[PDB]
Amino acid sequence: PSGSVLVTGGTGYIGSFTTLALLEAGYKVVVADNLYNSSAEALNRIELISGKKAEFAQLDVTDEAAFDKVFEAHPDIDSVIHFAALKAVGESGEKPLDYYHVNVYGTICLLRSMVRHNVTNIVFSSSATVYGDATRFPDMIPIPEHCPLGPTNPYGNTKFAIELAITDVINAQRNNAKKAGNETEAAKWNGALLRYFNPAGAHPSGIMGEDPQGVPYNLLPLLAQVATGKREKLLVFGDDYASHDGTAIRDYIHILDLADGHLKALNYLRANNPGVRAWNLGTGRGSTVYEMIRAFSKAVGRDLPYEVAPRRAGDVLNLTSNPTRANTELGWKAQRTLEQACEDLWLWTKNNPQGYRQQPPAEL
Amino acid sequence: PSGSVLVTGGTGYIGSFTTLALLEAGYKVVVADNLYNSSAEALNRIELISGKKAEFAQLDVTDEAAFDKVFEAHPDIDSVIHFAALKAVGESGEKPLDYYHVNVYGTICLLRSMVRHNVTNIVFSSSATVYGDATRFPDMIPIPEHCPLGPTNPYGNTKFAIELAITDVINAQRNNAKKAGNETEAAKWNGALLRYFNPAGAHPSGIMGEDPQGVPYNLLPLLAQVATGKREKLLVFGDDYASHDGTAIRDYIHILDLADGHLKALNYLRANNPGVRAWNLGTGRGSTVYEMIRAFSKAVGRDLPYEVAPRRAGDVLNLTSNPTRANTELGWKAQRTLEQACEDLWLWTKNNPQGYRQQPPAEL
Ligand SMILES: NC(=O)c1ccc[n+]([C@@H]2O[C@H](COP(=O)([O-])OP(=O)(O)OC[C@H]3O[C@@H](n4cnc5c(N)ncnc54)[C@H](O)[C@@H]3O)[C@@H](O)[C@H]2O)c1
Ligand SMILES: NC(=O)c1ccc[n+]([C@@H]2O[C@H](COP(=O)([O-])OP(=O)(O)OC[C@H]3O[C@@H](n4cnc5c(N)ncnc54)[C@H](O)[C@@H]3O)[C@@H](O)[C@H]2O)c1
Ligand SMILES: O=c1ccn([C@@H]2O[C@H](COP(=O)(O)OP(=O)(O)O[C@H]3O[C@H](CO)[C@@H](O)[C@H](O)[C@H]3O)[C@@H](O)[C@H]2O)c(=O)[nH]1
Ligand SMILES: O=c1ccn([C@@H]2O[C@H](COP(=O)(O)OP(=O)(O)O[C@H]3O[C@H](CO)[C@@H](O)[C@H](O)[C@H]3O)[C@@H](O)[C@H]2O)c(=O)[nH]1
């Protein structure tokens, strides 16, 4: 094997494609999830694509004893990728305690169990919401990693709190080893703070994609529901923004390039051993809402109906990425394009309108 | 009774004088502590001074079920003052996980139990370390509340993370009530973020003071050990600072004024109901290390011996407070002075060289 990796979440959206890329790289993957917002079927789809399958452990991330059982059964893990969290921004303003309990405390349980079993590498799933609004700063768009952090929602604060925790915990392990004159043990402890932006698309085979629980709230999944008949139309949130057409700007990156960025980051940790460092995982291409509706409509064939609604509270003007650091240091670049994401997203939705609770059509 | 209050910590340094001021105000106090860094004897000293005694509950703050038992036995609490935490800055760089588990997660358990039992007011014990170094900002000294936060140690990050949690949790309770057209229920939820600076001194009766576990590390307690014979001398950390004599600057506030600030804040919450707001609890008077050694030496009689050592890592130049907000809004001002603190501190140490594990001399 080319190494072992524990993947919390794993059965989730970004988690599934990440474990897929890991197995195809030759890694041994153990997936940890309580299946709150995903299905275990995603693993079966991985086996059909890669030929390899990951071991599955069903446990709550807030259960510290459960993390111990995993490391005791797999003492060769050495590195963990952390996806397990709650990601609904609006919901975080309704019940932030559940977010602080799952995201923050869940990470605490992980780190404690990590130190206890001597797994020294962690790759955290941070968001771009930690930057908040970047228009209050001159020449801060596109957004670099050295941008001062300041979230505007409880979800962002959880991610921001974890980043501070990851830095402190890991640096302590390194500094305590340096004090004891053990530079060897110090170099082993590393952390990758990957700040995702806006993910989109699915697998080109059309057998794997995003299948969450509850009602979708993101732009593309809602557009997919319009094009499939579940939704009547789309509600554009604000048309008076400082863009050219009037809609907000985001950085939409393909899920395949997003998941591949973990492989680059994990290698950079096992190589240089820089300790803790953050990286933006975007494309650098800013796209308006109107452009996305048009891009996805072109992928489907017909133009999807929409209606203009007032601005959504907490929505920033621009969230374009400055991925120059990730391109040079990690050697990672967004291969797939924005339009290329709409094509295999629509491929996934058209063939699988009911996600994983159905069996895909005759594919190969 | 003039209200009921749960006081986590309570048996600790700032906690003891706070519960003392609460009982003297007519409040009903239930003290929660695991006695990690304090003794239960402090309560007996309170009974001797105030005549009233607080109910004691021995429990870990990371035990959510224990918090439930308290609220179920005391359904009339309605408000909680949160002191329970780990405060050693240097130690936080050695084992930050224990700090994130006790400070951050302990607060999470409290809030969850608070929402569960409908106690709506919380007064958090924040530190001035959340400001970090304020010299990187023009005209930011003395330090106002609107200073952008940026800690330099894991201990500061825990306090900073909690502040964000307190804001999000409480604002959610208010906003959810507003959405349901219930402005009455929304006004009940409030939070006071009291950012302490540098506490000093003890009770003028000399029967109550600071008696922690382990070895002291703060300036005044170490000076007290020199003047009592336990220490040989004091080690001044750096004499090349940008002050007039060369030593660092801090804001030393008497523990009695510090504890009384909670009464003012608690009243401001039950009155205006502003939701969440931060207040600095200092004097505005900046004092160097040399001035403190001289001030305490004068309180003892003889001049204490000291030796100059290089700078301590993470020590900022200035930490003077800008308490103008606390003076106007809360109607709180530091009555006692700096020199007045050294006098009753030395009174406490001279008569009680072994803290609470001894019986005080014949006092009244
Ligand atoms: N989707 C986005 O636009 C976005 C953007 C930036 C960052 N992220 C972050 O990336 C990560 C993954 O996002 P995603 O889109 O893959 O979402 P997702 O919901 O598909 O993945 C999250 C996974 O966490 C699991 N989980 C939640 N609580 C758990 C618990 N207590 N115990 C065990 N498992 C638990 C869920 O079952 C799910 O599989 C999250 O941390 C999210 O905040 C996502
Ligand atoms: N001392 C300072 O210079 C300073 C300055 C700024 C802020 N503060 C903050 O003020 C608060 C009180 O400080 P203090 O000087 O009174 O220190 P302290 O040690 O006397 O008080 C802390 C109390 O917390 C208790 N405690 C710790 N962990 C616990 C747990 N898991 N369960 C139950 N109880 C637990 C201890 O037993 C102790 O009584 C702390 O939050 C501290 O960070 C102190
Ligand atoms: O029905 C809709 C949905 C969205 N939008 C707009 O489309 C853009 C993108 O919306 P969405 O997909 O919800 O993304 P963001 O609001 O940018 O935030 C998402 O992407 C973040 C990246 O950091 C994640 O952390 C969050 O969990 C996730 O809600 C925004 O400008 C919205 O105003 C609409 O106009 N109409
Ligand atoms: O032996 C000593 C101890 C201290 N100092 C100096 O005295 C000053 C005050 O030291 P100390 O009492 O340790 O206070 P701070 O370093 O300012 O921090 C304390 O006060 C904070 C207020 O926010 C709390 O949060 C921390 O827990 C606590 O360590 C500093 O300039 C030190 O460099 C010395 O020169 N020699």
Residue numbers in the entry:
A (entry chain A), B (entry chain A): 2 to 365
From the paper:
To this end, we have determined the ternary crystal structure of AnGALE complexed with NAD+ and UDP-Glcp. AnGALE was found to crystallize in the C2 space group with an asymmetric unit containing the characteristic homodimer previously reported in both the E. coli and Human forms, along with an additional monomer which also forms a dimer through symmetry. The three monomers are nearly identical with backbone root-mean-square deviation (r.m.s.d.) of 0.2, 0.4, and 0.2 Å between monomer A & B, monomer A & C, and monomer B & C, respectively. As can be seen, the structure folds into two domains consisting of an N-terminal motif (M1 - A201, red) and C-terminal motif (G202 - K371, blue). The NAD+ is anchored within this domain directly atop the β-sheet forming one half of the active site which exists in the cleft between the domains. There are a total of 16 hydrogen bonds anchoring the cofactor within the N-terminal portion of the active site cleft. Examination of the structures reveals the models are remarkably similar, the major difference being that AnGALE has an elongated and slightly bent α6 helix along with an additional short α7 helix prior to β6 compared to HGALE. Focusing on the reaction center, Y156, postulated to be the active site base in the Human enzyme (Y157), forms a similar hydrogen bond to the substrate 4'-hydroxyl group (3.4 Å) previously observed in HGALE (3.2 Å). Also of importance to the reaction mechanism is the hydride transfer distance between C4 of the sugar and C4 of the nicotinamide ring which was found to be 3.5 Å in both enzymes.
